[PDB]
Specification:
4 copies of one chain form a homotetramer. Chain A has 2 domains: 1-252 and 447-491, Aldehyde Dehydrogenase, Chain A, domain 1; 253-446, 3-Layer(aba) Sandwich (Aldehyde Dehydrogenase, Chain A, domain 2), CATH 3.40.309.10. Helices cover 38% and strands 20% of the residues of chain A. The longest helix of chain A is centred in the N-terminal third of the chain and has 21 residues, at 97-117. In chain A, helix 1 packs parallel to helix 7, helix 2 packs antiparallel against helix 4 and helix 9 (265-277) crosses helix 10. Chain A is α/β, with parallel strands linked by helices. Chain A is globular and about 85 Å long. Chain A has 15 helices and 20 strands. Chains in contact: A-B, A-C, A-D, B-C, B-D, C-D. The interface between A and D is medium-sized, with 26 and 27 residues. Strand 18 (436-439) of chain A pairs parallel with strand 20 of chain B, so a sheet runs across the interface. Residues 23-24, 92, 179-180 of chain B line the site of one sodium ion (NA). The site of one sodium ion has 5 residues of chain D, from strand 3. The PDB classes it as oxidoreductase. Keywords: BetB, rossmann fold, oxidoreductase, Center for Structural Genomics of Infectious Diseases. The assembly is tetrameric.
């Protein structure tokens, strides 16, 4: 019953060239669906439709209160279809059903948060420094927005972009990862049910290498919003520059998990596993870089390694499963290549580091949860985002050394500090160059607070009021209420 | 008594290669000063010093209240030295001394505004959706910032960047236009008198082609703030992408001056001259594109042309001067080439369009104030920013047509609507895709309100609270106040 | 099927003394229902329950997001029960069913607005002027709130108080007008369906003279929020002073309707009728004081008078009815007494000023729509709030005189300016000492914007962000992160 | 050289009846100065002048930027005259010169803060839920404000009221405590030097019993701002009610100083002395109610008592003095009466509790620093604000009991928690019903953050943005841009 087509200008349409793509379940590498594989001309048509819709004013000039009501209706549909959406996300991405349910709860809350925010702030009145003038700043929708999402949390990442775009009155063109389009197709069906003016929302399906440059480089786009890897992000930004187009980027990280000797030890072990291995480490927020105080380093490594051996791999639909497969053959190959890099530069693969042998896992894209030890900040395995079920462990002596090491990367997305000394944790948090810092927690983020990176982890923010602001533009309207001639130029 | 050197890491220093540049007065093309012409290694040293200073915390961890007091001290020095600063700006850039005084008054007010804003907003407390958590957003200085300014309003543009950078606790590296460094050198001397930690402020002098790429592309930069032309801006953005560096750009415009038939006619003529010819049209806010309602078009053209013939050209130091020279041989040549373009595509040079013949103007870079008529939106002369003492005049029939034509450019910086029907002016203002819209005024902007462009006129804002926000970064600190093990992974 | 009891500490309960009150329909003066008439001990028990619930934290420490979801659920129930609620409001208060439907649409929007606002703040991070300190302002629910509403728009006024109280996490005790409790009982039934912790919400039914002083004067109350008349409001404020309790008051007005000679004349006549006679003038926002420019005063009076003669009086349930009865015998008597005052001080009753004679209106509390002319600012009829279907008409010569007269009252709630000259309307609006000014409109207010009075019209605001803020209290938490002894006192 | 007169409507004037008052130095009870003792007619004249000035618009319509510049000029004058002002405050109030210097530094910062805030927020643009409307909220000065200050920190408390009143464009009438007018007279002289429109600022000198009711009860007042005791505050609020006038009250407190067994012990002793005895305990922020964990109660009492015996009493001008005299005979008598109350209800005067005998202290209004032990929450000595150099000590067993006891008073101004367990201190801080909570500090407050009380400690806030907001009023201006007749009433 799921659509196999793109959604352009109010219609479900095939690709202009009738091409298709088979979508795969990473658990067994079986084809689960076939969808349209769109062309660059389809993408251009969608952008032009979005522009036409924006200029018509049917959505952009709708009242903010009414826009909020429609975004709330989307939220309710997510909750109504929570089970089926979660199952589809697990089928498409491989992560556990429980993880998918949590995603759907978050997605409902994202739409609901932005629904509520829609009508809360139209700008400001400025006390003008010029007598006999009125000065106001009006906040308008930024315009036409292109939105590109990755394969790890397809619908969650889509919601972070769609909700504020709709709440503010923008028109959008979204393109999900070509290998994971299923939930994004479904959410477009649900949005269509709610009802938006023709051209306000558009869904393109296809390879980034075919349609991506149109989405980032088109002159009618006012904002490109992208979540993915650093290489694609940089390429998008350079293409966006051709029209001086606003960019919002979230590009992953090398997130430190800092564990002091006065941490609650079993909590720290639990959260080190959570940070490292949820969704097989395929998370922008993954705690791939463990920094542990020297005094407890050996204790910690032994404890972590013993637990990693017990992680239950399997089908995301099976209730006992703790960790599913990685997303694709290409991604598994990349993780495997990093194991070779790590060994060649002198690190130790303490546990894991290979494909599992078990019969029920042999047809899937599984990779064992892995701990890499005896490494240092100079190493590629420590500096680079592997985005797999892999953590490195480094020791540190002092609070100052923990901070130095944690900040010694090109990234700046998120991190954690574990210590029962809250004063110390707060000092460390203040010094980490990260968009989010958790004190005695991990992977906590939500619609109410902005998420994004310092340094190469991104530009701008998603979620919160700051997330909504990516979709607004300020206009200063200054009215002279007693205009007088300047009489500078001779008469 | 003015310094001839760069200011790097608390010391006035020559270029690493001892190279120098002769600075010219455009009124007579005479050499007025000789300054150091820095190298890319000087720029890198400055950026590294800025980073070191930032990490030291001496400025970034100073209280916001005290940072505000120092910014206020800069403001007071500008006012103290108003006369000498104005004279330097007029010598270096050619605009009238009266215009330069107005600039110094504005600059005082910019510093004073940001001094007052420094300690007014450290972030937010978030009502977390997770029980037993505290969520806060702390706003920190963005980090190390590079600041590149143009030749038209050197100190004014510098102040828009320096003031918020210092107020927020950033370290900065500034590079003024190579052809107009004098007031920027002077302001650095004044800042040095106020006293800032070593490395907090740095001044590089040199050609954009030699040191610009280091300033935009260095890994230790967190924000590149640029004001200038679109070609350089796009280039900067592409280079900034290499490290996913934030950019704030202001790139000029094709600003419409919309004159309805129910405008106060003599006011509209006065403001059309002001929009077209202040600083010989070398203004990001210049009203180069006049759109006049058809019913008064002939009346308007005759009136404007008659006034343009009376504009007094001369030395900026002479009180009777209404318009000085353009900035350089290269810029005058560009303006001259546009006259040829306009004629070839079928427009009429109604008045001006050449160098003036008068003896006292023959040694200077003068160009006559010009009105181009019988043109249309398809023409290069109408679409492209000439940045000279040149306006085009197009007619429109309806309010809808005025909006369409005004929005028919790649730019989106500022514009005006002249009409005694305020309701109509407000309708038009709401539909113009411009960062600033004046109703019955022109060239009005000030520290209290954000300034910047839609579309190819820029990214981000300068001035106002939004201007300060370019120099901040948000950090979400989430504390779990009752941490519990998740117990997801097997034990 | 409607409850007849109070709702105290999670239970529907009779009065402690078993007393009751008969509720009347003003259209026919028939008894329509009988409810409990509570005692001062019931009110005290409710306040103590509200305090106990607040201290338990079950609502006050619930997440803001979840509080918002519950307030949204109340909003949806209002819409679900729109027809029955509207009919009950018309039965109890006499206004037209069409007016009641509009109320129910507004009430839905009030709850929805506050539902969406619930989780959008939390407080601020302050950049502290003291080194080695953290400064934050946390916004908490104000505490226990008592809420007292009037008989004119019972559920609408209740919604303005309940929505923000619940959104912020307060516990509340509400007492509707003793003569119009029906829709307030119903909304409590609906809130019970949504589910709130025992003691969070409480409904007291009874005479202000019996239970009012407890509600305003109890030591466990943190805010008293009252909407009604000036005499009761002043009494409440004086009683609240005994515990230095916050007060939010809205006390009606003497609202000017300013009509210039360049107003759209038929619009001004239409809106003068709307301002004067909706709900038989029993509206805090009624335009009871018409100020009309002398040049059109005769034209205006004749046009208004001719229309007033055509106003259709009748049963609020009948679709042709334009104006229902007034609320009670006591109120009709008050209005009648004002007619005598007006004549005695020299004014003219130009039309109306008595009970209508028609057979179908004889059993109801009807009073004819009335226009009073030949009056001036010195008169009681002009200065005092009659709160009936009565308007006075005064002339003014100039814009300056209009402002002077409009501001010449003890009140300051709302007003309008009618003029096609928007600049003039804006000048006047800026000078009027009124919480709301309409330019070319009347009776426009909504959840998104604050409503309240200057001068004797009130203290504080309802609706908007400022309305929510009445229900919050600020706490500055300052942590010294490197505490040192002061060593002032000798050792 | 100091003025002896009132300042009314731009002129220094004596009392209407030529009455005067002798001002005393509490160190030696000698007459130090004689000032005018104004009449209620003088107060009325000042209020009418303030109203006339407000309506003139000369200050209320001045640009916010310029108002800020003038407030900054006042700040600079305070710093310029720091020495003389500090000496005058010490002469008039008795506190140490070092304390007075700190006050003057704080006062400079208060004026500077508000100077910087003046032009930062003129209101909001609202996204209206009604099509074809514009909705804006303009923030105006509240109007005419009366300001009444106490004798303990005369100029500091005056600055908290004057600075925001002037920044926002209000007109003000200030009346300092009749017994301590000196620095308030001086600051009026300084303000006059800056220059404000006639009637914008006014100073009344006299007994609260003679002129106070006019200041709180006059119909032309829009806000009464009072800092003092609860009895006077309640009386002011009841009088203000006569015109439904806004009130801002700060009425002192029973501030808890909570010391856990895991506090830094010597820090806690130091801060218990600071909280109890600065300005001889005559501070709204005094830590008069010490709550100490039972486990360390005996240790703490002995350590505190031993230190209290060493406190150096003397002349505020002498550098070795740690504590000066109390303010007046009447106040010393009140403190003495409380010693009798404490003993009669069963408490122990552990140290102090009498006038000192030493020869150099015999002519002054000295009272020994006192510690009261063996008391409980039921006692008047624990519940009531003594406002002298007196602390009570109660024990608590648990964190829960500490919170219960601390919240068991009618007040709610400020308090502290001392514990090295920052998580615990934060839990306690969140549960205390206090406007300010210090974690490991005491007496820390500043212009950047709001100060005020829950419960009987006050209404509203001073300092910070919220403090400025007491001096603003919101006006919703709603413009219908396409007005249509409603056609409800028959034609
Ligand atoms: N931040 C995150 O959540 C996240 C998610 C996925 C991957 N990554 C990182 O990126 C690495 C590479 O992953 P990847 O290559 O599979 O993902 P990617 O960075 O290319 O992101 C994929 C998305 O970008 C699109 N895309 C590709 N080329 C584009 C182009 N030229 N223009 C516009 N869009 C284009 C894809 O079609 C897809 O929608 C991963 O190993 C990981 O380190 C991060
Ligand atoms: Na898939
Ligand atoms: Na970045
Ligand atoms: Na030059
Ligand atoms: Na742009
Ligand atoms: Na009734
Ligand atoms: Na009032
Ligand atoms: Na004194
Ligand atoms: Na109170």
């Amino acid at each position: 019953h799921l659509s196999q087509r793109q959604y352009i200008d109010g219609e479900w349409v095939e690709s202009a060239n009738k091409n298709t793509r088979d979508i795969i379940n990473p658990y067994n590498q079986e084809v689960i669906f076939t969808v349209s594989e769109g062309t660059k001309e389809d993408a251009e048509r969608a952008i032009l439709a979005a522009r036409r819709a924006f200029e018509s004013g049917e959505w952009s000039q709708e009242t903010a209160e009414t826009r909020g009501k429609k975004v709330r209706a989307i939220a309710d549909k997510i909750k109504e279809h929570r089970e089926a959406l979660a199952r589809l996300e697990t089928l498409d991405t491989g992560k556990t059903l429980e993880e998918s349910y949590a995603d759907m709860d978050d997605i409902h809350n994202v739409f609901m948060y932005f629904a509520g925010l829609a009508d809360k702030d139209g700008g400001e009145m400025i006390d003008s420094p010029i007598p006999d003038t009125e000065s106001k700043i009006v906040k308008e929708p930024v315009g036409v927005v292109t939105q590109i999402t990755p394969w790890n949390y397809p619908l969650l990442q889509a919601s972070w972009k769609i909700a504020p775009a709709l709440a503010t009155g923008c028109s959008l063109v979204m393109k999900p990862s070509e290998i994971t389009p299923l939930t994004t197709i479904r959410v477009f069906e649900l949005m269509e049910e709610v009802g938006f003016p023709k051209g306000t929302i558009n869904l393109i399906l296809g390879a980034g290498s075919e349609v991506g440059d149109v989405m980032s480089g088109h002159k009618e786009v006012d904002l490109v919003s992208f979540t993915g890897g650093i290489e694609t992000g940089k390429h998008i930004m350079k293409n966006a520059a051709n029209n001086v187009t606003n960019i919002a980027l979230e590009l992953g990280g090398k997130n430190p998990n800092i564990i002091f000797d006065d941490a609650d030890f079993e909590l720290a072990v639990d959260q080190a596993l959570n940070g490292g291995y949820f969704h097989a480490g395929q998370v922008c927020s993954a705690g791939s870089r463990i920094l542990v105080q020297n005094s407890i380093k050996d204790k910690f490594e032994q404890a972590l390694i013993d637990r990693v051996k017990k992680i239950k791999l399997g089908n995301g639909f099976d209730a006992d499963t703790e960790m599913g497969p990685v997303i694709s053959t290409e991604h598994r190959n990349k993780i495997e290549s990093y194991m070779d890099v790590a060994k060649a530069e002198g690190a130790t693969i303490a546990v894991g580091g290979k494909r599992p042998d078990r019969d029920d896992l042999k047809d899937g894209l599984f990779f064992e949860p892995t701990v890499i030890t005896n490494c240092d900040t100079s190493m590629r395995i420590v500096q680079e985002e592997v985005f797999g079920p892999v953590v490195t462990v480094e020791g540190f002596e002092t609070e100052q050394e923990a901070i130095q090491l944690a900040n010694d990367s090109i990234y700046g997305l998120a991190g954690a500090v574990f210590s029962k000394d809250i004063g110390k944790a707060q000092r460390v948090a203040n010094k980490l160059k990260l968009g989010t810092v958790w004190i005695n927690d991990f992977h906590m983020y939500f619609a109410q607070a902005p998420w994004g990176g310092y340094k190469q982890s991104g530009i701008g923010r998603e979620l919160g009021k700051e997330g909504l602001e990516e979709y607004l533009v300020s206009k200063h309207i200054l009215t002279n209420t007693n205009p007088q001639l300047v009489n500078w130029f001779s008469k």
